[PDB]
Amino acid sequence: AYARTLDRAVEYLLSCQKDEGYWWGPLLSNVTMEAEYVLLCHILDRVDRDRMEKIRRYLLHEQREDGTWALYPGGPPDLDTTIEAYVALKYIGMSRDEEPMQKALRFIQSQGGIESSRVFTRMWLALVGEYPWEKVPMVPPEIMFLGKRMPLNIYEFGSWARATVVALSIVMSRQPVFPLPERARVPELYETDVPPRRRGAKGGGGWIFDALDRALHGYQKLSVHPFRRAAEIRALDWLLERQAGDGSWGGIQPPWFYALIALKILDMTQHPAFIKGWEGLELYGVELDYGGWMFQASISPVWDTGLAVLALRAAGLPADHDRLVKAGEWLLDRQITVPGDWAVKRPNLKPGGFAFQFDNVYYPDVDDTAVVVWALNTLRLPDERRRRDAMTKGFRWIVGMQSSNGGWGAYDVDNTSDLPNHIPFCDFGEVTDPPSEDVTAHVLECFGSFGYDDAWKVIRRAVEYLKREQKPDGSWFGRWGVNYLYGTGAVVSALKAVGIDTREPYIQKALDWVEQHQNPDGGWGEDCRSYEDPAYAGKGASTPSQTAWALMALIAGGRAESEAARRGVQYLVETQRPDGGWDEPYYTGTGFPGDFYLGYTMYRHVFPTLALGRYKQAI
Amino acid sequence: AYARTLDRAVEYLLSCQKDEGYWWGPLLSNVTMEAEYVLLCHILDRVDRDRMEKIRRYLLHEQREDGTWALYPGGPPDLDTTIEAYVALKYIGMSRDEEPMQKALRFIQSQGGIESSRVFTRMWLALVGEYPWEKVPMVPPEIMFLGKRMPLNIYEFGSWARATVVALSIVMSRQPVFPLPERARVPELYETDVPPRRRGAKGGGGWIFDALDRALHGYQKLSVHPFRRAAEIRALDWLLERQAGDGSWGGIQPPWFYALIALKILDMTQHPAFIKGWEGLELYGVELDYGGWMFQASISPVWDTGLAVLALRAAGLPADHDRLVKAGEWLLDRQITVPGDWAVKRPNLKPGGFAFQFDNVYYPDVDDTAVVVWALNTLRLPDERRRRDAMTKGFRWIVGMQSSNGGWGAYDVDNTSDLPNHIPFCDFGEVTDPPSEDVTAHVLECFGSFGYDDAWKVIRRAVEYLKREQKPDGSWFGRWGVNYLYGTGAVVSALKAVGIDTREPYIQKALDWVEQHQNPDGGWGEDCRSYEDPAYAGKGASTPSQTAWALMALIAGGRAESEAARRGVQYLVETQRPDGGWDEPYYTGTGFPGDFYLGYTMYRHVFPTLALGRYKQAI
Ligand SMILES: C=CCN(C)CCCCCCOc1ccc(C(=O)c2ccc(Br)cc2)c(F)c1
Ligand SMILES: C=CCN(C)CCCCCCOc1ccc(C(=O)c2ccc(Br)cc2)c(F)c1
Ligand SMILES: CCCCCCCCOCCOCCOCCOCCO
Ligand SMILES: CCCCCCCCOCCOCCOCCOCCO
């Protein structure tokens, strides 16, 4: 039955594999990457008329009928995203008259205007002179002086937040202004009567910070700020020490962009670091077939290659398949062997993790390290010395990274401080990196491959953590993937692998939940709204990936030979394309709950395969 | 008569001009650059059989009958240069047996062996494990803590010294060892009965540092060195901050190589600085036509382009010559507009100097700045705006560099501390950058063209400086060019340009000295020995450059219509090659009096033209 689905899915995946032997699907986010790029180019005085044209095509193409832009496809209009897209276009050429510019302008107005957008948006606008700097939460160079164990030192923030904060402290330190030509000034972003509805600090504002901010803004005004020259040079130095191999910082868009702005502020355009940073940008860009161009928020090669392998194996290919080997060898050269920023909490831990992207040695993550190691543990390579070797370093590093509660975070250990969540500046997404159910589940499944189990103290501490986190309805939240369908699938699949008894009550209470959310069309789906309003948990249009996820939670808990189970397999079988692929016009990836969503291009192909591979196993 | 000669020299130079519009002659030094590269490659584990071949044919081709290598051509065998070339070869393939390995080994031994070589040589050997680290002068990371105004802080050393010291402090901090395979171990460098005759610190040993070093080597042995981790990172960051545009450090070989070694030590072979630093190396290499390969100690494009222009103008071509304009435009894009290290003594000085090489913004020198500005002054470029403007910026940067005595140094102001000259480590060449007669003369000659006479207090302070420095026999020492013939030509040619009276006594006492040293063959020549033993001042085989120098001192002081004057012009007119060029198998350039000599390829072509250009003027 489904067997021709598996055969077609396989050959397809294999067609996607690059030569070097890895898979790499583009990462989808939202138009702010491109809009901010347009502005970075203006700031760095490096505008390419031809590029802008491809950009403008994309920006419009992405705009909706109502004239707004959202975070995920089919999502509510977003103010920040639309403001930034609006200014981006008006600068590229569009006149505030044109139908498209018209619609958006009226939406931005209906919302209270520029005064209702996040810090980043008002800050970007501050940079081109269309918004007062005095009204932007202040982050000072001096933060560089807080020691390792101090409230708010840069190591209390999550990896991604950290590097951005440092880059910005230099920029906010000088509060520079790169004027836009009159042609693109956007005063009209203020023309509204609607009351400005401002978003506050992610975790609630303490009148303390509010005051501290006001304090910092006045201080900024003095004629002399002692040791500030130093604070800066401490930041710049922190920056130059980490710049990734591809010229980026952390392999993510934000700190990368800010770090480049920062060197321009510091008159260092002709310094190796600035040059590598500038030209490394091109690797993240993507030429869209319909004429546009988009910039990736980050890149997922290692991650794609990792899942790719596991799916093709669970799906059937021999552990020594000449094509799967190209991948194994490739993954081995990827392992990171030097102290990262994680070393600050675990100095006697031996380097051995992996990154999400190509070259990013200072920021390996537990999620990637686990999937890559586990994946290797399923292949038979030529240099069995290295495979054995690599797997252990990664493994010992994963265990070394386990946080206090028994679960794993993404980049750091016990990055659970609650302090950063209240600063005025922090009003967008997560800012700390605490342990999550999904990353933890992926670790356990990994250990479980090697056979470790409920008997080992490390694994019990974890399962205790998962048991305590389980939601009332027996579902598990999905931190890096949308959402409860993602998390529950991950946990139940893991708990099954670490020997736990699939019959337990809390486990059953979970599968019931999964069978209970199947759409009429057989498959499962969960809309990104499930982070905002609970009435959406497990509800949403069916997707090949989210179906595949619910399928694993069932196949894992024994219910493989079920109705909902066989009904779901039908969905994947029916909806597959003639080439073996799958379509998925929705986002199933999560950047930050409620604020940033991602589209993982390979999920639609890999997971359906991995689920079908495991179904063909239960038989 | 001479006109056909000049006419040909002019067209020859014009044929050497690269496309972009600049001239660039290879810089010749000695085989240590290549021998050290071979070792750098071993250390960094990046050996290319094919290069080692070219490097071997080259080292061999440079060895002499007696089986030794010298600093300059026709110079006395050099122990350091030979030891290093010996080890280089033995590593590439040569067996201690073969004729070359034999003759050199004998020389080496007859000198006391490895124990008689400079610090660098014993240090390089220490790095591959053929010499104890404990016996090498120690320079610690901690030197990084001495403040701006403290005995021995890194800013008391000259630009070139400084960067090397920083790079090394990190290396000496770890005292790493990269073992050579048994095949190349060189124990035989110790097998000698001759008493090891060690060279001491440049200015002299103080029993203090002699103690303090033992001090350090002792502290080096402890189990704990507080704040050293941070002393190191200071040196690391210091380096990351100043890395040149081409990935080098200071555009010179020493700090560049040591900085790379230092990064490797710190597992930073995955970092942007090191990558760019490593691939930058190819630009300095040179493919030799006989199948050899040599690495330049530094590169002189700006410098060549500068004189090139001045010679072609003094010779005749229109100040608006479409060919010189390509050069003018090029030189304008070269001007450095950011605070260098010189800013540490002159914070309110506006950047406007130029560098010796292509991209080296942190280290512009007065010599280049002066020649480039002046040469531009003799042109008419299509952008009288930028031309007028740069000259002014550079002018001021020159003016603001004028040291305490009125005379300029190369890279820094009053870099006259006498302290560094006594450290055990400093036993090779200069280590500070005090003002010299030649740089000062080139500055004066620059102002001169604008129209600035002896009225201006600026000028006078300088001329006072020169007058006081003049040697007993009316000659002027040559710091960056060999030697008294160089200096004296520079001075007298300058004093003439700043309005001074060519008839004065001290001036005449100079020209007489010129006339008095003319070699019978009509020209002038000065051997590099004139730095070691006074007998050679103004003595040595006649060269096209040195002749042209003595010719300017004469044309300047009125004696253009003289015997020695027309006799010298005869020499150039004749010795000139059929293509228009000139040959010059000797070095006329000075790296460090007595220790490091350079061969400026373009000197043989540019100066004879410039001297003939000025003779065709006095008529
Ligand atoms: C799925 C499994 C693999 N997993 C371990 C890696 C995937 C997560 C990393 C990719 C996301 O990268 C980011 C991250 C953030 C941002 C911010 O906007 C941000 C927001 C706030 C701040 Br403060 C700074 C930047 C961004 F733009 C991109
Ligand atoms: C005439 C034109 C203008 N003039 C100012 C520029 C020409 C001089 C710069 C070119 C030479 O550069 C150097 C310099 C040094 C060294 C050292 O060996 C050295 C030895 C000891 C130490 Br401690 C450090 C480096 C070197 F190898 C090369
Ligand atoms: C430079 C001192 C050598 C000691 C290195 C151990 C550093 C441990 O890492 C601490 C955490 O900071 C993250 C470092 O990654 C940055 C690279 O810095 C370069 C060499 O340390
Ligand atoms: C990085 C803080 C910005 C203040 C720097 C201006 C300091 C003036 O220079 C002092 C002398 O140090 C030499 C600097 O050249 C090195 C580059 O460092 C990067 C930016 O200054």
Side-chain angles (χ1 to χ4, degrees), chain B residues 27 33 120 160-161 164 252-254 297-298 303 356 365 367-368 410-411 428 430-431 480 592 596 598 600 603:
Chain B
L27 194 61
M33 309 286 97
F120 285 142
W160 62 81
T164 307
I252 62 183
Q253 181 268 352
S298 179
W303 185 244
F356 183 60
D365 59 272
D367 221 357
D368 275 290
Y411 298 106
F428 185 72
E430 298 283 275
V431 169
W480 300 96
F592 298 132
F596 198 66
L598 306 171
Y600 287 73
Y603 279 18

mmCIF file of all heavy atoms in Angstrom, chain B residues 27 33 120 160-161 164 252-254 297-298 303 356 365 367-368 410-411 428 430-431 480 592 596 598 600 603, ligand 2:
data_model
loop_
_atom_site.group_PDB
_atom_site.id
_atom_site.type_symbol
_atom_site.label_atom_id
_atom_site.label_comp_id
_atom_site.label_asym_id
_atom_site.label_seq_id
_atom_site.Cartn_x
_atom_site.Cartn_y
_atom_site.Cartn_z
ATOM 1 N N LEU B 27 60.866 43.313 -3.187
ATOM 2 C CA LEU B 27 61.829 43.700 -2.170
ATOM 3 C C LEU B 27 62.730 42.518 -1.861
ATOM 4 O O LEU B 27 62.265 41.421 -1.532
ATOM 5 C CB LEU B 27 61.101 44.162 -0.902
ATOM 6 C CG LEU B 27 61.925 44.918 0.139
ATOM 7 C CD1 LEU B 27 62.450 46.180 -0.496
ATOM 8 C CD2 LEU B 27 61.086 45.255 1.346
ATOM 9 N N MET B 33 63.610 34.616 5.406
ATOM 10 C CA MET B 33 62.180 34.722 5.155
ATOM 11 C C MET B 33 61.705 33.351 4.667
ATOM 12 O O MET B 33 60.784 32.763 5.247
ATOM 13 C CB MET B 33 61.895 35.765 4.090
ATOM 14 C CG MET B 33 62.534 37.124 4.323
ATOM 15 S SD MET B 33 61.754 38.089 5.596
ATOM 16 C CE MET B 33 62.792 37.714 6.934
ATOM 17 N N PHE B 120 66.028 35.192 17.703
ATOM 18 C CA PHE B 120 65.079 34.645 16.749
ATOM 19 C C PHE B 120 65.447 33.260 16.266
ATOM 20 O O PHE B 120 64.609 32.349 16.276
ATOM 21 C CB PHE B 120 64.909 35.590 15.568
ATOM 22 C CG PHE B 120 64.092 36.806 15.885
ATOM 23 C CD1 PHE B 120 64.433 38.047 15.354
ATOM 24 C CD2 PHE B 120 62.949 36.707 16.684
ATOM 25 C CE1 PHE B 120 63.644 39.170 15.611
ATOM 26 C CE2 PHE B 120 62.165 37.822 16.942
ATOM 27 C CZ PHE B 120 62.513 39.053 16.404
ATOM 28 N N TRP B 160 57.312 48.162 14.178
ATOM 29 C CA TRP B 160 57.686 46.796 13.812
ATOM 30 C C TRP B 160 58.004 45.886 15.017
ATOM 31 O O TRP B 160 57.644 44.692 15.023
ATOM 32 C CB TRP B 160 58.875 46.846 12.847
ATOM 33 C CG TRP B 160 60.109 47.462 13.433
ATOM 34 C CD1 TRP B 160 61.027 46.860 14.257
ATOM 35 C CD2 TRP B 160 60.531 48.819 13.298
ATOM 36 N NE1 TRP B 160 61.988 47.768 14.642
ATOM 37 C CE2 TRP B 160 61.708 48.976 14.067
ATOM 38 C CE3 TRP B 160 60.027 49.920 12.603
ATOM 39 C CZ2 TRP B 160 62.385 50.181 14.161
ATOM 40 C CZ3 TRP B 160 60.702 51.127 12.697
ATOM 41 C CH2 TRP B 160 61.876 51.244 13.478
ATOM 42 N N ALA B 161 58.657 46.454 16.036
ATOM 43 C CA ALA B 161 59.047 45.720 17.246
ATOM 44 C C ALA B 161 57.830 45.327 18.042
ATOM 45 O O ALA B 161 57.612 44.151 18.374
ATOM 46 C CB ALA B 161 59.957 46.582 18.104
ATOM 47 N N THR B 164 55.512 42.449 17.079
ATOM 48 C CA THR B 164 56.225 41.178 17.201
ATOM 49 C C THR B 164 56.225 40.716 18.635
ATOM 50 O O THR B 164 56.035 39.534 18.939
ATOM 51 C CB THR B 164 57.698 41.303 16.773
ATOM 52 O OG1 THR B 164 57.781 41.881 15.461
ATOM 53 C CG2 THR B 164 58.357 39.916 16.779
ATOM 54 N N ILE B 252 54.625 43.389 7.307
ATOM 55 C CA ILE B 252 55.986 42.892 7.432
ATOM 56 C C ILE B 252 55.919 41.422 7.829
ATOM 57 O O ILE B 252 54.949 40.953 8.433
ATOM 58 C CB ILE B 252 56.813 43.699 8.461
ATOM 59 C CG1 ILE B 252 56.204 43.592 9.848
ATOM 60 C CG2 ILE B 252 56.889 45.157 8.031
ATOM 61 C CD1 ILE B 252 56.949 44.413 10.859
ATOM 62 N N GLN B 253 56.961 40.695 7.480
ATOM 63 C CA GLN B 253 57.003 39.270 7.719
ATOM 64 C C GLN B 253 56.995 38.746 9.157
ATOM 65 O O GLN B 253 56.179 37.868 9.489
ATOM 66 C CB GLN B 253 58.204 38.688 6.957
ATOM 67 C CG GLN B 253 58.396 37.194 7.064
ATOM 68 C CD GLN B 253 59.315 36.803 8.203
ATOM 69 O OE1 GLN B 253 59.948 37.645 8.853
ATOM 70 N NE2 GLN B 253 59.404 35.514 8.443
ATOM 71 N N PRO B 254 57.858 39.301 10.047
ATOM 72 C CA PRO B 254 57.953 38.853 11.452
ATOM 73 C C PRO B 254 56.671 38.755 12.285
ATOM 74 O O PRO B 254 56.234 37.647 12.639
ATOM 75 C CB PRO B 254 58.969 39.816 12.048
ATOM 76 C CG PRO B 254 59.735 40.320 10.837
ATOM 77 C CD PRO B 254 58.641 40.535 9.853
ATOM 78 N N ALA B 297 60.026 40.310 2.389
ATOM 79 C CA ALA B 297 60.014 40.740 3.796
ATOM 80 C C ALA B 297 58.869 41.764 3.974
ATOM 81 O O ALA B 297 58.223 41.830 5.022
ATOM 82 C CB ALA B 297 61.361 41.361 4.178
ATOM 83 N N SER B 298 58.620 42.548 2.927
ATOM 84 C CA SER B 298 57.537 43.535 2.898
ATOM 85 C C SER B 298 57.313 43.900 1.443
ATOM 86 O O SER B 298 58.010 43.392 0.577
ATOM 87 C CB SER B 298 57.896 44.784 3.681
ATOM 88 O OG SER B 298 56.837 45.714 3.613
ATOM 89 N N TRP B 303 55.482 53.260 -2.190
ATOM 90 C CA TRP B 303 56.814 53.834 -2.293
ATOM 91 C C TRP B 303 57.343 53.867 -3.745
ATOM 92 O O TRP B 303 57.901 54.874 -4.213
ATOM 93 C CB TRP B 303 57.745 53.021 -1.408
ATOM 94 C CG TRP B 303 59.123 53.548 -1.304
ATOM 95 C CD1 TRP B 303 60.263 52.936 -1.728
ATOM 96 C CD2 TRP B 303 59.532 54.770 -0.674
ATOM 97 N NE1 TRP B 303 61.362 53.694 -1.399
ATOM 98 C CE2 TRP B 303 60.943 54.826 -0.751
ATOM 99 C CE3 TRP B 303 58.845 55.823 -0.049
ATOM 100 C CZ2 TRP B 303 61.682 55.892 -0.225
ATOM 101 C CZ3 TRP B 303 59.584 56.885 0.476
ATOM 102 C CH2 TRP B 303 60.989 56.907 0.383
ATOM 103 N N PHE B 356 53.491 52.086 3.280
ATOM 104 C CA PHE B 356 54.515 51.603 2.365
ATOM 105 C C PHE B 356 53.837 50.605 1.426
ATOM 106 O O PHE B 356 54.056 50.625 0.202
ATOM 107 C CB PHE B 356 55.618 50.927 3.207
ATOM 108 C CG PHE B 356 56.810 50.412 2.425
ATOM 109 C CD1 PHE B 356 57.593 51.268 1.668
ATOM 110 C CD2 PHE B 356 57.211 49.080 2.560
ATOM 111 C CE1 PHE B 356 58.757 50.812 1.071
ATOM 112 C CE2 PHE B 356 58.369 48.613 1.970
ATOM 113 C CZ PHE B 356 59.147 49.477 1.226
ATOM 114 N N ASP B 365 53.667 55.823 7.359
ATOM 115 C CA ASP B 365 54.953 56.344 7.753
ATOM 116 C C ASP B 365 55.147 57.727 7.155
ATOM 117 O O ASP B 365 54.520 58.098 6.149
ATOM 118 C CB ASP B 365 56.098 55.392 7.345
ATOM 119 C CG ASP B 365 56.165 55.136 5.836
ATOM 120 O OD1 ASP B 365 55.493 54.198 5.357
ATOM 121 O OD2 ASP B 365 56.890 55.875 5.135
ATOM 122 N N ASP B 367 57.899 58.898 5.829
ATOM 123 C CA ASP B 367 58.664 58.848 4.592
ATOM 124 C C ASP B 367 57.758 58.740 3.368
ATOM 125 O O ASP B 367 57.884 59.516 2.416
ATOM 126 C CB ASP B 367 59.644 57.683 4.640
ATOM 127 C CG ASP B 367 60.983 58.051 4.073
ATOM 128 O OD1 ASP B 367 61.110 59.200 3.600
ATOM 129 O OD2 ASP B 367 61.902 57.207 4.099
ATOM 130 N N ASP B 368 56.842 57.775 3.409
ATOM 131 C CA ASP B 368 55.889 57.553 2.324
ATOM 132 C C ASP B 368 54.917 58.719 2.192
ATOM 133 O O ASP B 368 54.623 59.182 1.087
ATOM 134 C CB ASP B 368 55.099 56.272 2.578
ATOM 135 C CG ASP B 368 55.805 55.057 2.086
ATOM 136 O OD1 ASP B 368 55.897 54.894 0.857
ATOM 137 O OD2 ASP B 368 56.271 54.272 2.931
ATOM 138 N N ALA B 410 60.052 57.464 11.644
ATOM 139 C CA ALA B 410 59.304 56.779 10.583
ATOM 140 C C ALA B 410 57.812 56.591 10.814
ATOM 141 O O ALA B 410 56.981 57.029 10.003
ATOM 142 C CB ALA B 410 59.939 55.426 10.297
ATOM 143 N N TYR B 411 57.494 55.931 11.927
ATOM 144 C CA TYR B 411 56.122 55.619 12.315
ATOM 145 C C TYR B 411 55.565 56.348 13.554
ATOM 146 O O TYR B 411 54.356 56.567 13.655
ATOM 147 C CB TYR B 411 56.023 54.115 12.541
ATOM 148 C CG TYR B 411 56.319 53.306 11.315
ATOM 149 C CD1 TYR B 411 57.521 52.622 11.187
ATOM 150 C CD2 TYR B 411 55.390 53.206 10.285
ATOM 151 C CE1 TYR B 411 57.792 51.852 10.064
ATOM 152 C CE2 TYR B 411 55.647 52.440 9.160
ATOM 153 C CZ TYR B 411 56.845 51.765 9.058
ATOM 154 O OH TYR B 411 57.072 50.987 7.953
ATOM 155 N N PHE B 428 68.712 41.951 17.771
ATOM 156 C CA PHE B 428 68.734 42.040 16.305
ATOM 157 C C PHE B 428 68.147 43.344 15.732
ATOM 158 O O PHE B 428 66.949 43.590 15.814
ATOM 159 C CB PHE B 428 67.989 40.817 15.727
ATOM 160 C CG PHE B 428 68.031 40.717 14.225
ATOM 161 C CD1 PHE B 428 69.199 40.376 13.569
ATOM 162 C CD2 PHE B 428 66.901 40.985 13.469
ATOM 163 C CE1 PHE B 428 69.244 40.307 12.182
ATOM 164 C CE2 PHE B 428 66.938 40.917 12.084
ATOM 165 C CZ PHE B 428 68.114 40.578 11.442
ATOM 166 N N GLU B 430 67.318 47.479 14.957
ATOM 167 C CA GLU B 430 66.687 48.536 15.749
ATOM 168 C C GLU B 430 65.447 48.034 16.477
ATOM 169 O O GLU B 430 64.832 47.060 16.061
ATOM 170 C CB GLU B 430 66.291 49.695 14.837
ATOM 171 C CG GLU B 430 67.466 50.338 14.149
ATOM 172 C CD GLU B 430 68.234 51.255 15.071
ATOM 173 O OE1 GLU B 430 67.828 52.440 15.191
ATOM 174 O OE2 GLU B 430 69.226 50.782 15.679
ATOM 175 N N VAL B 431 65.073 48.701 17.559
ATOM 176 C CA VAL B 431 63.900 48.282 18.305
ATOM 177 C C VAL B 431 63.097 49.496 18.710
ATOM 178 O O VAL B 431 62.064 49.386 19.369
ATOM 179 C CB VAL B 431 64.294 47.436 19.545
ATOM 180 C CG1 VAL B 431 63.111 47.244 20.449
ATOM 181 C CG2 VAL B 431 64.767 46.057 19.103
ATOM 182 N N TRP B 480 67.647 54.557 6.167
ATOM 183 C CA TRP B 480 66.872 53.617 5.358
ATOM 184 C C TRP B 480 67.402 53.340 3.961
ATOM 185 O O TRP B 480 66.715 52.730 3.155
ATOM 186 C CB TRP B 480 65.417 54.080 5.263
ATOM 187 C CG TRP B 480 64.749 54.180 6.626
ATOM 188 C CD1 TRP B 480 64.618 55.301 7.384
ATOM 189 C CD2 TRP B 480 64.212 53.104 7.411
ATOM 190 N NE1 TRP B 480 64.043 54.995 8.588
ATOM 191 C CE2 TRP B 480 63.783 53.653 8.631
ATOM 192 C CE3 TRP B 480 64.062 51.730 7.200
ATOM 193 C CZ2 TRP B 480 63.209 52.878 9.642
ATOM 194 C CZ3 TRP B 480 63.492 50.955 8.203
ATOM 195 C CH2 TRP B 480 63.072 51.533 9.411
ATOM 196 N N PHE B 592 68.012 47.636 8.823
ATOM 197 C CA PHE B 592 68.562 48.030 10.114
ATOM 198 C C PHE B 592 70.062 48.113 9.964
ATOM 199 O O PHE B 592 70.684 47.123 9.591
ATOM 200 C CB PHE B 592 68.244 46.984 11.163
ATOM 201 C CG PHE B 592 66.786 46.809 11.401
ATOM 202 C CD1 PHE B 592 66.223 45.541 11.424
ATOM 203 C CD2 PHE B 592 65.978 47.920 11.649
ATOM 204 C CE1 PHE B 592 64.883 45.368 11.694
ATOM 205 C CE2 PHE B 592 64.627 47.767 11.923
ATOM 206 C CZ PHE B 592 64.078 46.482 11.946
ATOM 207 N N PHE B 596 70.155 44.159 8.832
ATOM 208 C CA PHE B 596 69.165 43.773 7.822
ATOM 209 C C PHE B 596 69.199 44.697 6.617
ATOM 210 O O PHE B 596 68.881 45.880 6.734
ATOM 211 C CB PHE B 596 67.765 43.821 8.443
ATOM 212 C CG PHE B 596 66.733 43.055 7.681
ATOM 213 C CD1 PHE B 596 66.813 41.666 7.578
ATOM 214 C CD2 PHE B 596 65.669 43.716 7.068
ATOM 215 C CE1 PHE B 596 65.842 40.938 6.871
ATOM 216 C CE2 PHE B 596 64.690 43.003 6.356
ATOM 217 C CZ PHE B 596 64.776 41.611 6.257
ATOM 218 N N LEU B 598 68.159 45.526 2.413
ATOM 219 C CA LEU B 598 67.134 45.279 1.422
ATOM 220 C C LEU B 598 67.549 45.726 0.045
ATOM 221 O O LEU B 598 68.333 46.659 -0.112
ATOM 222 C CB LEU B 598 65.870 46.032 1.790
ATOM 223 C CG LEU B 598 65.290 45.810 3.183
ATOM 224 C CD1 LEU B 598 64.157 46.838 3.381
ATOM 225 C CD2 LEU B 598 64.806 44.348 3.352
ATOM 226 N N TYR B 600 66.042 47.262 -3.256
ATOM 227 C CA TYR B 600 64.884 47.876 -3.898
ATOM 228 C C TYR B 600 65.077 47.806 -5.406
ATOM 229 O O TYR B 600 65.862 48.545 -5.999
ATOM 230 C CB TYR B 600 64.699 49.338 -3.444
ATOM 231 C CG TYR B 600 64.181 49.526 -2.017
ATOM 232 C CD1 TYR B 600 65.003 49.289 -0.908
ATOM 233 C CD2 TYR B 600 62.880 49.959 -1.779
ATOM 234 C CE1 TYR B 600 64.543 49.481 0.398
ATOM 235 C CE2 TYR B 600 62.409 50.154 -0.472
ATOM 236 C CZ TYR B 600 63.249 49.913 0.608
ATOM 237 O OH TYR B 600 62.804 50.107 1.892
ATOM 238 N N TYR B 603 64.954 51.071 -7.611
ATOM 239 C CA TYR B 603 65.973 52.093 -7.392
ATOM 240 C C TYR B 603 66.882 52.221 -8.591
ATOM 241 O O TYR B 603 67.132 53.321 -9.068
ATOM 242 C CB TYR B 603 66.795 51.782 -6.139
ATOM 243 C CG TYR B 603 66.141 52.197 -4.839
ATOM 244 C CD1 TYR B 603 64.767 52.454 -4.768
ATOM 245 C CD2 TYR B 603 66.879 52.274 -3.663
ATOM 246 C CE1 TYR B 603 64.144 52.770 -3.556
ATOM 247 C CE2 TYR B 603 66.268 52.583 -2.445
ATOM 248 C CZ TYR B 603 64.904 52.822 -2.401
ATOM 249 O OH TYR B 603 64.308 53.049 -1.190
HETATM 250 C C1 LIG C 2 62.041 53.840 2.638
HETATM 251 C C2 LIG C 2 60.705 53.809 2.648
HETATM 252 C C3 LIG C 2 59.916 54.017 3.923
HETATM 253 N N1 LIG C 2 60.321 53.124 5.032
HETATM 254 C C4 LIG C 2 59.972 53.737 6.318
HETATM 255 C C5 LIG C 2 59.649 51.831 4.901
HETATM 256 C C6 LIG C 2 60.652 50.717 4.584
HETATM 257 C C7 LIG C 2 60.990 49.962 5.872
HETATM 258 C C8 LIG C 2 59.942 48.864 6.102
HETATM 259 C C9 LIG C 2 60.263 47.655 5.210
HETATM 260 C C10 LIG C 2 61.027 46.624 6.042
HETATM 261 O O1 LIG C 2 60.113 46.002 6.943
HETATM 262 C C11 LIG C 2 60.684 45.175 7.899
HETATM 263 C C12 LIG C 2 61.012 45.676 9.184
HETATM 264 C C13 LIG C 2 61.590 44.830 10.155
HETATM 265 C C14 LIG C 2 61.856 43.464 9.871
HETATM 266 C C15 LIG C 2 62.488 42.598 10.966
HETATM 267 O O2 LIG C 2 63.252 41.574 10.578
HETATM 268 C C16 LIG C 2 62.318 42.800 12.478
HETATM 269 C C17 LIG C 2 63.481 42.749 13.296
HETATM 270 C C18 LIG C 2 63.390 42.911 14.702
HETATM 271 C C19 LIG C 2 62.134 43.126 15.316
HETATM 272 BR BR1 LIG C 2 62.045 43.313 17.164
HETATM 273 C C20 LIG C 2 60.951 43.184 14.513
HETATM 274 C C21 LIG C 2 61.043 43.021 13.098
HETATM 275 C C22 LIG C 2 61.518 42.956 8.560
HETATM 276 F F1 LIG C 2 61.735 41.688 8.218
HETATM 277 C C23 LIG C 2 60.940 43.813 7.593
#
